[PDB]
mmCIF file of C-alpha atoms and ligand atoms in Angstrom:
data_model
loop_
_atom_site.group_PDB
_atom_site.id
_atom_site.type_symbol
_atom_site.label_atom_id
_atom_site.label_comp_id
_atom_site.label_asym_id
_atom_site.label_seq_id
_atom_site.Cartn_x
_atom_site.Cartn_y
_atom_site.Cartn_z
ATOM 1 C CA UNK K 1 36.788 -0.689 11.245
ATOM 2 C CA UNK K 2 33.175 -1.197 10.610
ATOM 3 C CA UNK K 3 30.843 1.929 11.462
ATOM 4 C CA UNK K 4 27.604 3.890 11.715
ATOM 5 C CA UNK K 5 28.693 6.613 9.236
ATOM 6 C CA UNK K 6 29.638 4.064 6.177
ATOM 7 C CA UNK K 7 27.192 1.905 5.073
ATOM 8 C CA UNK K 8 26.606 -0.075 0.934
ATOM 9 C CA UNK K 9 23.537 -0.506 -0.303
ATOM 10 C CA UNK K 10 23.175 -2.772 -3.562
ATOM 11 C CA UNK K 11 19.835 -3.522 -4.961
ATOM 12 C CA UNK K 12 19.868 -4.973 -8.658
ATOM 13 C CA UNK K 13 22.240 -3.603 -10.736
ATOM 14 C CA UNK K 14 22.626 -0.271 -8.370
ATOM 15 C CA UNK K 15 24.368 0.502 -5.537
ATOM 16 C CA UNK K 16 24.783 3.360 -2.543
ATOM 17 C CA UNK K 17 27.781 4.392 -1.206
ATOM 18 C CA UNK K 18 27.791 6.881 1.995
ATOM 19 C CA UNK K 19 30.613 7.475 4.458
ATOM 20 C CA UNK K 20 28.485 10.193 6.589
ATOM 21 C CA UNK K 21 25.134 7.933 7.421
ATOM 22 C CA UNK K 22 23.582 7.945 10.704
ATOM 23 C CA UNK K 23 22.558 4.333 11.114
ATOM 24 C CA UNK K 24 19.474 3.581 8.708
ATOM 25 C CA UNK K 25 15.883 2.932 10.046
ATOM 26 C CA UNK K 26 13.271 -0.175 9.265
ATOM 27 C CA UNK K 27 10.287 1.602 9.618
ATOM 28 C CA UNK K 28 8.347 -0.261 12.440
ATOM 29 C CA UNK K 29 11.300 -2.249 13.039
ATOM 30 C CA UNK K 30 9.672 -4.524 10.095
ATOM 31 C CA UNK K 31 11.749 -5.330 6.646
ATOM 32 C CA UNK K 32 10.125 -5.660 3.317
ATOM 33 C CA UNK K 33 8.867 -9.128 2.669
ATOM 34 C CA UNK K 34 6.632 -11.226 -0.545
ATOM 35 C CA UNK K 35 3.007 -12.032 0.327
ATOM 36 C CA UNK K 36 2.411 -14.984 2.460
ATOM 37 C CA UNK K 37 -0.474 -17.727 1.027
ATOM 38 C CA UNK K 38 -2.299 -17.315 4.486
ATOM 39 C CA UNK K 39 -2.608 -13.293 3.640
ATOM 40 C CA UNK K 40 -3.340 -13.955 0.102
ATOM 41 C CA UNK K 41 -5.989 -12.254 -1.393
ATOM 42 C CA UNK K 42 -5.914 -12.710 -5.478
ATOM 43 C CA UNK K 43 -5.456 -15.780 -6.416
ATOM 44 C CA UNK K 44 -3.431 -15.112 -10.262
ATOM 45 C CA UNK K 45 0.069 -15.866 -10.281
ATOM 46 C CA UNK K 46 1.579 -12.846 -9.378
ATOM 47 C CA UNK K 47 4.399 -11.543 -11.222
ATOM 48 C CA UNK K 48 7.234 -10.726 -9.224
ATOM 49 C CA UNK K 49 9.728 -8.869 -11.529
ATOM 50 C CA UNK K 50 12.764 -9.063 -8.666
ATOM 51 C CA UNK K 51 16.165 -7.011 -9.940
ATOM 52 C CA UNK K 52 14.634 -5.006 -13.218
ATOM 53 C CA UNK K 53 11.975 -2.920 -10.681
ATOM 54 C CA UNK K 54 13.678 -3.618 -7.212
ATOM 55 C CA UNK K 55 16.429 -1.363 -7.797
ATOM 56 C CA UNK K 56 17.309 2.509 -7.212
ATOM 57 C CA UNK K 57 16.216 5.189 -9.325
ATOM 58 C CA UNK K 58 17.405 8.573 -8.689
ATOM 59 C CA UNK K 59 14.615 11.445 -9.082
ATOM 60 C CA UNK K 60 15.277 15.166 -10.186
ATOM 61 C CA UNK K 61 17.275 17.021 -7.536
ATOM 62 C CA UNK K 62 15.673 19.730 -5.702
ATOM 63 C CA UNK K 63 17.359 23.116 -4.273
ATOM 64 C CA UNK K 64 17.989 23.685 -1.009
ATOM 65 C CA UNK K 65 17.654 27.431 -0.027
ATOM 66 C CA UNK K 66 17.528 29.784 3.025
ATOM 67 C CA UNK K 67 13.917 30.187 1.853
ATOM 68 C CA UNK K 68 12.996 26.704 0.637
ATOM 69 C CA UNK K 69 9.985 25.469 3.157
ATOM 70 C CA UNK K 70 10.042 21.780 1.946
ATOM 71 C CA UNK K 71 9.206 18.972 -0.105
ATOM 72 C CA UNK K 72 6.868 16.077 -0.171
ATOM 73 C CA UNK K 73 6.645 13.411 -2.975
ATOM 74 C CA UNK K 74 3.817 10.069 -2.967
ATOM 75 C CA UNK K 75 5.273 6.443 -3.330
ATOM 76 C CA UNK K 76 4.709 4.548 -5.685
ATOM 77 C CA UNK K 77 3.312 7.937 -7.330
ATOM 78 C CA UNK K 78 7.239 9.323 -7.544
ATOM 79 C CA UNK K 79 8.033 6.022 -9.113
ATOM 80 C CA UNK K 80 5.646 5.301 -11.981
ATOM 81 C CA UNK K 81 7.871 6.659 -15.115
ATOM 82 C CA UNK K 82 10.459 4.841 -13.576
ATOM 83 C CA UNK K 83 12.032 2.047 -16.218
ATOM 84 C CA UNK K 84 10.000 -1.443 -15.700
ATOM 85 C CA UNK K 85 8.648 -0.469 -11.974
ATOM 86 C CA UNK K 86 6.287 2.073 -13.930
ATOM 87 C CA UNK K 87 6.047 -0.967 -16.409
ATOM 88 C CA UNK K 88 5.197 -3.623 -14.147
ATOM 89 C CA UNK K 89 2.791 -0.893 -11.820
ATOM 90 C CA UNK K 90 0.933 0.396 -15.083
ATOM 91 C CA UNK K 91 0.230 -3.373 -16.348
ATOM 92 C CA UNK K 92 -1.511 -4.452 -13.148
ATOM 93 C CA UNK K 93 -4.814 -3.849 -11.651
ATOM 94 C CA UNK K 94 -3.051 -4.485 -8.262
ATOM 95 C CA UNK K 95 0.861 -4.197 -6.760
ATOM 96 C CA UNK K 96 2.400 -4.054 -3.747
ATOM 97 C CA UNK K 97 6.455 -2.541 -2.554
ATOM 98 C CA UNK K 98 8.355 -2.163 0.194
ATOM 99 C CA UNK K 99 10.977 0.871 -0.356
ATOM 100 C CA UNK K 100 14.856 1.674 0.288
ATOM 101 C CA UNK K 101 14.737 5.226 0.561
ATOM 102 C CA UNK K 102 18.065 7.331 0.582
ATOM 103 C CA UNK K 103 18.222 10.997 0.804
ATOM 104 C CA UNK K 104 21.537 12.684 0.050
ATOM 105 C CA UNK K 105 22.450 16.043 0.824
ATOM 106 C CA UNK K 106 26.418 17.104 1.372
ATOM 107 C CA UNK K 107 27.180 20.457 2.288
ATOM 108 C CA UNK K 108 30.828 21.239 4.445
ATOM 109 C CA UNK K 109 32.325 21.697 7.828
ATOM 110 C CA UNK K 110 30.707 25.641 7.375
ATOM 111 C CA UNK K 111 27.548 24.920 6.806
ATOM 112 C CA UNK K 112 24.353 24.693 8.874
ATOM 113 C CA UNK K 113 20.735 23.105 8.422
ATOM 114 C CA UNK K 114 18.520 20.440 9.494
ATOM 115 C CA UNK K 115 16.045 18.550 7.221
ATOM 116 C CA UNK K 116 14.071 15.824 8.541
ATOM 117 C CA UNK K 117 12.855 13.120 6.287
ATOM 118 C CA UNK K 118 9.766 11.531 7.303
ATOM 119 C CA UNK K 119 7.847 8.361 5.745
ATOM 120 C CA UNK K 120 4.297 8.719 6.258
ATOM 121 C CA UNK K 121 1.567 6.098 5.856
ATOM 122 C CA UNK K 122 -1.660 7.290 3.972
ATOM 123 C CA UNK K 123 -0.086 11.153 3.809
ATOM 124 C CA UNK K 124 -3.507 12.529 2.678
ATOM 125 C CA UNK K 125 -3.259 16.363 2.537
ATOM 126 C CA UNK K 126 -5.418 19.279 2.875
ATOM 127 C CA UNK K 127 -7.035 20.821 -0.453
ATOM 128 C CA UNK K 128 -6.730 24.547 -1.061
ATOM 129 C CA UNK K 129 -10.608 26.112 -1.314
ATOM 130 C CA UNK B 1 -23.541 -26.284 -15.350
ATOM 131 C CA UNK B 2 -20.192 -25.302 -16.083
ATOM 132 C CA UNK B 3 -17.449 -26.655 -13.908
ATOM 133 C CA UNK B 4 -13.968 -25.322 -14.890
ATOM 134 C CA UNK B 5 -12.295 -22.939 -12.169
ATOM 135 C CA UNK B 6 -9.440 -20.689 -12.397
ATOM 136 C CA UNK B 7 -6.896 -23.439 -12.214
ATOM 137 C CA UNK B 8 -8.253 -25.153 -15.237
ATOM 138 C CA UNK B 9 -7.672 -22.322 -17.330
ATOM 139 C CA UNK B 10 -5.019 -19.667 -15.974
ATOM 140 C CA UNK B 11 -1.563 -19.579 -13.910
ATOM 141 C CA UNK B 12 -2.051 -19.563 -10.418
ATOM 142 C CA UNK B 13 -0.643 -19.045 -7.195
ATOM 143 C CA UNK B 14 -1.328 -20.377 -3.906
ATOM 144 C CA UNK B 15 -3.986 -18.583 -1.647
ATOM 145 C CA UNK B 16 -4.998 -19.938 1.387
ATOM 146 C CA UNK B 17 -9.004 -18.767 1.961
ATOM 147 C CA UNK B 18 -10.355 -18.829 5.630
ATOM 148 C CA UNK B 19 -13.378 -17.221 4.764
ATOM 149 C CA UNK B 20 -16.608 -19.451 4.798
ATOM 150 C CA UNK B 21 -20.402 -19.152 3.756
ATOM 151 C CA UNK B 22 -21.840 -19.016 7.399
ATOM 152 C CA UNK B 23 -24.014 -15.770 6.270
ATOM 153 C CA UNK B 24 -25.944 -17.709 3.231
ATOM 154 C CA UNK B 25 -26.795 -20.967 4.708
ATOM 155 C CA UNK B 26 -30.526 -20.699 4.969
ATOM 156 C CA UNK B 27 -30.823 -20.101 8.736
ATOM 157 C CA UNK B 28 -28.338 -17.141 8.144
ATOM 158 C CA UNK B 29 -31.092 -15.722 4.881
ATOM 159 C CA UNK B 30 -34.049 -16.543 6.653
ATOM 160 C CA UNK B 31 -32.853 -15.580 10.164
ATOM 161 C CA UNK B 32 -34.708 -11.758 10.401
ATOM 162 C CA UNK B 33 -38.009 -10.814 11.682
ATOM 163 C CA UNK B 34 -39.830 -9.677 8.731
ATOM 164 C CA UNK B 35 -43.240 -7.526 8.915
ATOM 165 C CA UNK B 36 -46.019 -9.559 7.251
ATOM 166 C CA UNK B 37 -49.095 -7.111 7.651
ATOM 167 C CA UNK B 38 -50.461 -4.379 9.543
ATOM 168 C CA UNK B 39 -53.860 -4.221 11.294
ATOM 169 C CA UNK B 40 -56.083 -1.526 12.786
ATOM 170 C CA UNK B 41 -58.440 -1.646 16.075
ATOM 171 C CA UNK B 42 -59.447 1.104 17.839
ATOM 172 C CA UNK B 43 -61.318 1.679 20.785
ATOM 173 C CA UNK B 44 -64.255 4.644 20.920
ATOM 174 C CA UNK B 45 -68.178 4.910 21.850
ATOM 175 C CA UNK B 46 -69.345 2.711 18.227
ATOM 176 C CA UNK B 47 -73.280 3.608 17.930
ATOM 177 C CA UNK B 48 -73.130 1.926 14.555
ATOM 178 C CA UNK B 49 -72.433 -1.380 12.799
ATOM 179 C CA UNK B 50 -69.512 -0.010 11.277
ATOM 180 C CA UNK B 51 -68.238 1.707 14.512
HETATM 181 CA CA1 CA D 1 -3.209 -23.969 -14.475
HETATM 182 CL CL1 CL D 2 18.481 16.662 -11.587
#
């Protein structure tokens, strides 16, 4: 019954449905986790605002064309007008997230395309002069 | 002196510190070889007192 293809995905008051996944990765096999008191650093109590930031938000769709060349978007950058993540982040000196990420494109049986959908630690990116 | 710290006063959480103050005990501060002065000598044919 169970399968690679159809997977949930509640966080907070939000949840994923898909029934044509391919698995889901853990980037460097390693899953989110809070801050440990031997890897502390500041020493406030942090705030740790749990289901009203930890939850999905859904960003303006993009278009898809036989011309498009891609996309790129900055986390937590994508994220800071987003209800009390953007509060919490814009509060604070200092933060820290892990991420669910899901992409969602649906075409048919007709179509064809590839996209790949890379995470990339410290993208820093060429300026243009 | 004063002798609150940030418990006495604010919310906080644990943090564990390993770091230590092995660079200011005063064999760390004093341990450099400092330049105290500079002389002059030279060597030449002196013909006077000042030579
Ligand atoms: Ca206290
Ligand atoms: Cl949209």
């Amino acid at each position: 019954g169970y399968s690679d293809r159809v997977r949930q995905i509640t966080l907070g008051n939000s949840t994923i449905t898909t029934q044509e996944a391919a698995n889901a990765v853990v980037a460097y096999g390693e899953w989110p986790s809070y801050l440990d008191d031997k890897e502390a650093n500041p020493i406030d109590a942090p705030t740790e605002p749990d289901v009203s930031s930890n939850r999905f938000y859904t960003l303006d769709s993009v278009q898809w064309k036989s011309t498009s060349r891609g996309w790129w978007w900055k986390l937590p950058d994508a994220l800071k007008d987003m209800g009390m993540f953007g509060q919490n982040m814009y509060y604070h000196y200092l933060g820290r997230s892990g991420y669910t990420v899901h992409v969602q494109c649906n075409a048919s049986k007709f179509h064809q395309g590839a996209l790949g959908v890379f995470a990339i630690p410290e993208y820093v990116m060429a300026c243009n002069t | 002196s004063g002798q609150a710290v940030p418990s006495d006063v604010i919310e906080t959480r644990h943090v564990v510190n390993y770091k230590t103050r092995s660079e200011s005990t005063l064999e760390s501060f004093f341990g450099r070889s400092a330049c105290v002065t500079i002389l002059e000598v030279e060597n030449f044919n002196a013909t006077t007192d000042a030579d």
